[PDB]
Write an enzyme that holds these catalytic residues in place. Sequence first.
Site, short mmCIF file in Angstrom:
data_model
loop_
_atom_site.label_atom_id
_atom_site.label_comp_id
_atom_site.label_asym_id
_atom_site.label_seq_id
_atom_site.Cartn_x
_atom_site.Cartn_y
_atom_site.Cartn_z
N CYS A 106 1.04 -1.07 0.35
CA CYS A 106 -0.34 -0.06 0.01
C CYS A 106 1.34 1.34 0.42
O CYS A 106 1.58 1.38 0.71
CB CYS A 106 -0.67 -0.21 1.40
N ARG A 109 -0.20 4.69 3.15
CA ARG A 109 0.28 4.35 4.21
C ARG A 109 0.20 5.68 5.02
O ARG A 109 -0.05 5.36 6.58
CB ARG A 109 1.13 3.23 4.48
N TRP A 278 -9.27 6.17 -0.84
CA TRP A 278 -9.90 6.37 -1.54
C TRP A 278 -8.80 6.04 -3.20
O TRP A 278 -7.51 5.95 -2.69
CB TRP A 278 -9.52 8.47 -1.52
N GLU A 283 -5.29 4.08 -11.00
CA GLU A 283 -5.98 2.78 -10.95
C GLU A 283 -6.97 2.59 -11.59
O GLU A 283 -6.56 1.12 -12.13
CB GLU A 283 -6.26 2.50 -8.90
C1 HEM Z 1 -6.32 6.43 1.37
C2 HEM Z 1 -6.27 5.61 0.42
C3 HEM Z 1 -5.47 5.01 -0.34
C4 HEM Z 1 -5.01 4.38 -1.00
C5 HEM Z 1 -4.41 5.49 -2.44
C6 HEM Z 1 -3.75 3.04 -1.30
C7 HEM Z 1 -3.69 2.90 -1.91
C8 HEM Z 1 -2.95 1.26 -2.37
C9 HEM Z 1 -3.17 0.60 -4.07
C10 HEM Z 1 -2.67 1.48 -5.64
C11 HEM Z 1 -2.61 -0.70 -3.67
C12 HEM Z 1 -2.21 -1.57 -4.60
C13 HEM Z 1 -3.28 -1.54 -5.73
C14 HEM Z 1 -3.56 -2.55 -7.03
O1 HEM Z 1 -3.01 -1.06 -7.60
O2 HEM Z 1 -4.06 -2.96 -7.38
C15 HEM Z 1 -2.53 -0.85 -2.37
C16 HEM Z 1 -3.24 -1.78 -2.04
C17 HEM Z 1 -3.22 -2.34 -0.64
N1 HEM Z 1 -3.54 -1.44 -0.08
FE1 HEM Z 1 -3.82 0.62 -0.07
N2 HEM Z 1 -4.78 2.95 0.18
C18 HEM Z 1 -5.14 3.34 0.36
C19 HEM Z 1 -5.89 2.57 1.43
C20 HEM Z 1 -6.16 1.42 2.47
C21 HEM Z 1 -7.03 1.42 3.41
C22 HEM Z 1 -7.48 2.20 4.22
C23 HEM Z 1 -6.48 0.15 3.07
C24 HEM Z 1 -6.84 -0.93 4.67
C25 HEM Z 1 -7.01 -0.19 6.12
C26 HEM Z 1 -5.20 0.34 2.70
C27 HEM Z 1 -4.42 -1.80 2.73
C28 HEM Z 1 -3.97 -2.31 1.10
C29 HEM Z 1 -3.72 -3.60 0.82
C30 HEM Z 1 -4.29 -4.46 2.11
C31 HEM Z 1 -3.10 -3.58 -0.39
C32 HEM Z 1 -3.03 -5.05 -1.20
C33 HEM Z 1 -4.32 -5.38 -1.33
C34 HEM Z 1 -4.20 -6.12 -2.64
O3 HEM Z 1 -3.90 -6.91 -3.41
O4 HEM Z 1 -5.20 -5.14 -3.43
N3 HEM Z 1 -5.38 0.87 1.34
N4 HEM Z 1 -3.45 0.48 -1.35
C1 LIG Z 2 -8.58 0.64 0.46
C2 LIG Z 2 -7.60 0.79 -1.05
C3 LIG Z 2 -8.09 2.36 -1.70
C4 LIG Z 2 -7.14 2.52 -2.55
N1 LIG Z 2 -6.72 3.75 -3.52
N2 LIG Z 2 -7.08 1.69 -3.82
C5 LIG Z 2 -7.05 -0.10 -3.49
C6 LIG Z 2 -6.50 -1.25 -4.19
C7 LIG Z 2 -7.49 -2.00 -4.80
C8 LIG Z 2 -7.15 -3.49 -3.74
N3 LIG Z 2 -7.21 -4.42 -4.59
C9 LIG Z 2 -7.00 -3.71 -5.47
C10 LIG Z 2 -7.12 -2.68 -6.26
O1 LIG Z 2 -8.15 -1.80 -7.80
C11 LIG Z 2 -7.82 -2.38 -8.57
C12 LIG Z 2 -8.92 -3.52 -9.17
N4 LIG Z 2 -7.86 -4.80 -9.87
C13 LIG Z 2 -7.34 -5.73 -9.07
C14 LIG Z 2 -6.57 -6.69 -8.85
C15 LIG Z 2 -5.60 -7.50 -8.85
C16 LIG Z 2 -6.24 -8.59 -9.55
C17 LIG Z 2 -6.69 -10.36 -9.72
C18 LIG Z 2 -5.36 -10.66 -8.69
C19 LIG Z 2 -4.94 -10.06 -7.57
F1 LIG Z 2 -4.09 -9.97 -7.04
C20 LIG Z 2 -5.45 -8.43 -7.60
C21 LIG Z 2 -7.78 -0.32 -1.88
#
Ligand code: HEM
Ligand SMILES: Cc1cc(N)nc(C[C@@H]2CNC[C@H]2OCCNCCc2cccc(F)c2)c1
Lengths: 407, 411
Positions: A106, A109, A278, A283
Amino acid sequence: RFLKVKNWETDVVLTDTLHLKSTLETGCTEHICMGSIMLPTKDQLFPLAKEFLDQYYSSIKRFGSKAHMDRLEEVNKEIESTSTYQLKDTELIYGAKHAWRNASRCVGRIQWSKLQVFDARDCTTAHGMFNYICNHVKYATNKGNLRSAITIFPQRTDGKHDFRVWNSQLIRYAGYKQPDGSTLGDPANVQFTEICIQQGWKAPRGRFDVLPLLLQANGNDPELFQIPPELVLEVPIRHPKFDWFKDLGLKWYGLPAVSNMLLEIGGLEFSACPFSGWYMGTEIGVRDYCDNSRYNILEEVAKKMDLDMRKTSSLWKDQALVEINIAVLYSFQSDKVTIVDHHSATESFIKHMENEYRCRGGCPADWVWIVPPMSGSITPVFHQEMLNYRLTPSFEYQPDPWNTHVW
Amino acid sequence: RFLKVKNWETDVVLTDTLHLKSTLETGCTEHICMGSIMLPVATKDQLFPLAKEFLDQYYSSIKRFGSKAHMDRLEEVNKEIESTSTYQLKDTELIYGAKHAWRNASRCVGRIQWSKLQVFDARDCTTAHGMFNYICNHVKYATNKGNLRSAITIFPQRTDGKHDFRVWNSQLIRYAGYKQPDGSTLGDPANVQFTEICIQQGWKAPRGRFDVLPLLLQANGNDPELFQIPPELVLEVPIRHPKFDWFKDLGLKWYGLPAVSNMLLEIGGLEFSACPFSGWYMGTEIGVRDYCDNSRYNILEEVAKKMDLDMRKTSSLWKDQALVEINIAVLYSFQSDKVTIVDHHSATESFIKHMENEYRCRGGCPADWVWIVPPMSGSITPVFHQEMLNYRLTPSFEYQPDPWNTHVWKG
Ligand code: HEM
Ligand SMILES: Cc1cc(N)nc(C[C@@H]2CNC[C@H]2OCCNCCc2cccc(F)c2)c1
Ligand code: HEM
Ligand SMILES: Cc1cc(N)nc(C[C@@H]2CNC[C@H]2OCCNCCc2cccc(F)c2)c1
Ligand SMILES: C[C@H](O)[C@H](O)[C@H]1CNc2nc(N)[nH]c(=O)c2N1
Ligand SMILES: C[C@H](O)[C@H](O)[C@H]1CNc2nc(N)[nH]c(=O)c2N1
Ligand SMILES: [Zn+2]
């Protein structure tokens, strides 16, 4: 044992000591690096509980204090008879925020401590779950001024009484396969969308059909629920300069809300814990729209820009990808809905790494995930060495419920 | 054990068994991943085992594993090791070695071309002047009037580590960088320190934005000496843009031949400390990294100004917007001058084909995603969606400390 990271753009050098308080396994060996792999009882549940309380009480400066010891013994007792235990509210809030704090993938954070935790452990039905969810969505959206939140349903017991949200996100668009072989809407959700129709969803079969929620409470068959449309803030996508942009018919939802992860605190497993923050503009703009197996609109957009598609080397894919992403950010801003661009998010995460190194002794970070999928090297995280390791409390992936569930 | 990698775009799973044939550590552990860390005198005892492994590999590839010729080569090498404390690679061995080093270079996206590589054996070289001559002939052959060809030139191996051949330059062709009194840099900020060393060594610096540095060459452990590459040998391309006429007014140019000369070639235990190699550029190397890195020429601002971009708010993607135009301009100039170059879309696609094929016929392709994924437009290139396994095979190219840090001066 002490490890240094260097930024090659600024020469800043940070010393990592946090990774020695590391506990799960990375998938890497001394012989092989797996950094780019997407996914590499009574006896057991106690030491986990002890390590978690150790870390909790040390955070509120009551390490080795009587309250600490007294909690420890009280937990060990509930364990030695019930086979599990219950977190106190303060522990639950602290554990949630830290799971976010330790999420190495993430980039967002910097915000980890301002999380709103809705304790839904008194839930017992899917209607309950629906009500918790709508409330979460409405609070998080906050009329466009989004606020991070997580709603936490009852922990696992025997693993046949799980609470699960079957959607991978609270709010996502339908995917329909077609009698010509093409796809309409979002192909990532094609299977989920079949599962919804085969549980009785009447699908309007359009391009941006908000999926129904599908909820499983306490091991039961799960059930469909339309989120009230007035709760789903959607943003029509337009361009600052290209008047024509509007007629591609694109929109996106404001609330990203991950709903298929498992929250692990002190060995307790919260299998349903939807959380939301958000969007970072890429994304939606890079991945959602331009991934080949997603909305895949590059071919179409560059067409409208009258660029030269005759060769990869005119960088027509690249030119268009930029405008698309200028457009997403412009729409969200103009509409007063929180969004961050990839430049500003990455700068913040640099500042956050810096903070975490001086305050905590490090920050587990997954470079493959933190580097935005466009313009990598022009963001400062690109030049930043990062150490990836798995700290607890944490979010973990878990199997798609439809492979696991028993009907 | 077998390990699978998935491409998430096309759903292709592949199975790596090759990682088993792999001795060197990675920097990672079960508890920490160092996948994004840039950088995480051998004796008899150690030498034979390494020679053996290598020769086993060599003779396998020619399908003579077990043959009299194989056994007798082992025994001649073992003998030569016991007697002389090192040994000499045959020509055929050296060629195979170099090709395999490249094929094993997990950070290289260009590896589809690995078997076509021209090997120049400069193991007879004894002096800096002999090096200058070898390297000049490398540059002329590799440049080939803009129709670049892969080449590597290999100088004598390390002996007691006191008689090293080294090319002090990081590439055979690179622009000077000059730190001024005011804090700004004229030319390439990456080559400041090296430039200072050249000037100290007696180079008279023209002090322009694009001065080709002299070669600074060390033979047989000796102090290095300065040489100007003949400029008719240095092929350059003035950078202009297909639609923006003001772009040429920026004054930019770049050389056509990427030629790395600071790496160490390890083959069957032998260390070749000077082995410069060259191929041809991927566009993004120049247009993203060379021009747009904040620590390099850093033209992003100047180009954005010239485009009338809204530069008051990052969320206008004014950086992203200029980046593409600069990369357009670099590809366009090279193609128009008939100088070999490849864009990132085509290089990455090519690499995916190579990597698939490598799994088919070899059982794996070690690969470093952090480095294979291009520095712009990552997810629209198919490597971004490709899981990769990274591990260390020999023969290999390794990093070595900068010689000004380790060299013992004679005067
Ligand atoms: C406030 C704005 C936030 C932004 C901009 C953000 C951004 C991101 C991004 C760009 C990713 C990679 C996702 C992708 O490209 O597929 C990600 C993954 C992740 N984030 Fe955040 N985050 C935010 C808030 C949060 C919150 C509130 C949580 C949990 C309480 C969180 C937990 C996680 C976790 C566990 C992943 C990895 C899981 C996955 O594969 O999607 N984030 N985050
Ligand atoms: C809370 C929060 C905020 C934010 N700005 N962004 C997020 C990431 C979401 C989470 N998870 C994907 C992101 O949204 C993108 C959707 N694509 C799917 C990516 C994918 C497809 C197949 C297998 C995988 F392991 C992962 C979470
Ligand atoms: C044929 C055209 C080639 C292309 C397009 C190419 C491409 C690249 C690129 C883009 C990198 C990453 C460097 C960076 O961006 O900083 C790289 C790394 C590397 N490549 Fe190639 N390559 C080519 C030929 C060769 C040849 C001939 C060799 C050796 C025989 C080679 C071996 C290597 C090595 C050893 C690295 C690691 C460089 C480092 O760590 O700084 N490549 N390649
Ligand atoms: C032969 C060939 C062809 C080609 N197209 N491209 C190349 C890459 C060169 C090699 N070398 C980097 C690239 O040139 C860029 C120079 N940057 C140095 C990278 C670096 C900096 C600090 C620490 C490190 F461990 C590494 C070679
Ligand atoms: C193969 C590779 O692991 C995969 O494409 C990853 C790479 N980096 C990513 N980074 C983010 N932020 N999100 C993703 O879905 C991915 N996909
Ligand atoms: C910190 C990080 O490992 C470093 O900036 C790397 C990332 N990826 C790279 N990729 C390439 N092709 N070349 C590079 O110099 C780098 N630098
Ligand atoms: Zn690793």
